[PDB]
């Protein structure tokens, strides 16, 4: 008593996680953003240390060569000194379509 | 940390290292009225449960006609000594399929 199906849920987070890495920021429902964190940062932590095995495992997740290239190259070093908390969630009102709570989820970067 | 501190002194550090599928002899104390006898049990380990003070292992013995399984508490005072006879070369954590082995030479 708690004290989408599994396949669809896993695929959605895999896709959304890839989009977040590619764009550094995405607009999505607040519950999705909160649950996405438990899938996103673990990728960046693995990318902090580079190895053949880590590269392969990082590919097995998100199943995309572009993301793996994006990781291990700049997301790794840019967060090497940071111990967790690579993500930030900003609430941005409600979606007009169905009044869903929306929030921007964005990596702590882009300080130009 | 309260639980761990309480069990460290209760545990025994003389536990021999054994792996599933090994042939093990275990000595167990026996009480008959007013006498303490040492009983020797021969068998093959088919399962090990590691939980610290609650660690236990299952030993299956092929008796005269049918097998007998016995779950021993590693840290219980009842068990006195454990000796390994053969180094079984299996590659499974739990050997339950023996209900219905090579030798490691390492």
């Amino acid at each position: 008593m708690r004290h989408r199906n599994s396949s669809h849920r896993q695929a959605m987070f895999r896709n959304m996680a890839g989009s977040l890495v590619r764009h550094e920021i995405i607009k999505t429902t607040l519950p999705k953003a909160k649950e996405l964190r438990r899938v996103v940062e673990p990728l960046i932590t693995l990318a902090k240390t580079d190895s053949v095995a880590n590269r392969r495992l990082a590919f097995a997740r998100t199943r995309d060569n572009e993301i793996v290239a994006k990781l291990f190259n700049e997301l790794g070093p840019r967060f090497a000194s940071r111990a967790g908390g690579y993500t930030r969630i900003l609430k941005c009102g409600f979606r007009a379509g169905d009044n869903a709570p929306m929030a921007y989820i964005e990596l702590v970067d882009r300080s130009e | 940390n309260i639980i761990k501190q309480l069990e460290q002194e209760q545990m025994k550090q003389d536990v021999p290292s054994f792996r599933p599928g090994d042939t093990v002899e275990v000595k167990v104390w026996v009480v008959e009225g007013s006498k303490k006898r040492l009983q020797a049990f021969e068998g093959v380990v088919i399962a090990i449960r590691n939980r610290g003070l609650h660690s236990a292992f299952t030993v299956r013995k092929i008796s005269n006609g049918e097998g007998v399984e016995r779950v021993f508490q590693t840290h219980s005072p009842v068990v006195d000594s454990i000796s390994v006879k053969r180094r079984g070369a299996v590659r499974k954590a739990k050997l339950y399929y023996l209900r219905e082995i090579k030798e490691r030479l390492n």
């Binding site: - | 007998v68 399984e69 779950v71 219980s76």
Partner: protein
């Protein structure tokens, strides 16, 4: 199964004696007669009578 050598090979339990709505004694079967099924946390995972006395509390059984 029968642990002894009385001749019987397979038996069925038809009543669990020892209490209402229940090595305990049981009643088994076309001959119906009583029978007996044969602390540290360990577990041990793996006989006929005469309806009046054991005569295969079980000194004889343990000795045999």
């Amino acid at each position: 199964n029968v642990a002894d050598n009385s001749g019987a090979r397979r038996v069925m339990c038809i009543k669990v004696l020892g209490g209402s709505h229940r090595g305990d004694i049981i009643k088994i079967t076309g001959d119906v007669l009583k029978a007996v099924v044969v602390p540290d946390g360990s577990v041990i995972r793996f006989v006929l009578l005469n309806n009046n006395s054991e005569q295969p509390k079980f000194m004889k059984i343990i000795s045999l």
